[PDB]
């Protein structure tokens, strides 16, 4: 599964397996 919260990203893998780097700053 893919949660959601203010978690800054730089790459897809940044977040938990399922999410992508949300085009804004934080995961999406």
From Swiss-Prot:
GO molecular function list: serine-type endopeptidase inhibitor activity
GO CC terms of this entry: extracellular region
InterPro entries linked to this entry: Prot_inh_squash, Proteinase_amylase_inhib_sf
Sites marked Reactive bond: 4-5
Domain of life of the source: Eukaryota
Ranges that cross the membrane: none
PROSITE patterns in UniProt: SQUASH_INHIBITOR
Assigned protein family: Belongs to the protease inhibitor I7 (squash-type serine protease inhibitor) family.
Function per UniProt: Inhibits trypsin.
Domain notes: The presence of a 'disulfide through disulfide knot' structurally defines this protein as a knottin.
Protein name (database record): Trypsin inhibitor 2
Species name: Ecballium elaterium (Squirting cucumber)
Lineage of producing organism: Eukaryota, Viridiplantae, Streptophyta, Embryophyta, Tracheophyta
């Amino acid at each position: 599964g893919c949660p959601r919260l203010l978690m800054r990203c730089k790459q897809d893998s940044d977040c938990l397996a399922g999410c992508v780097c949300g085009p804004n700053g934080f995961c999406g």
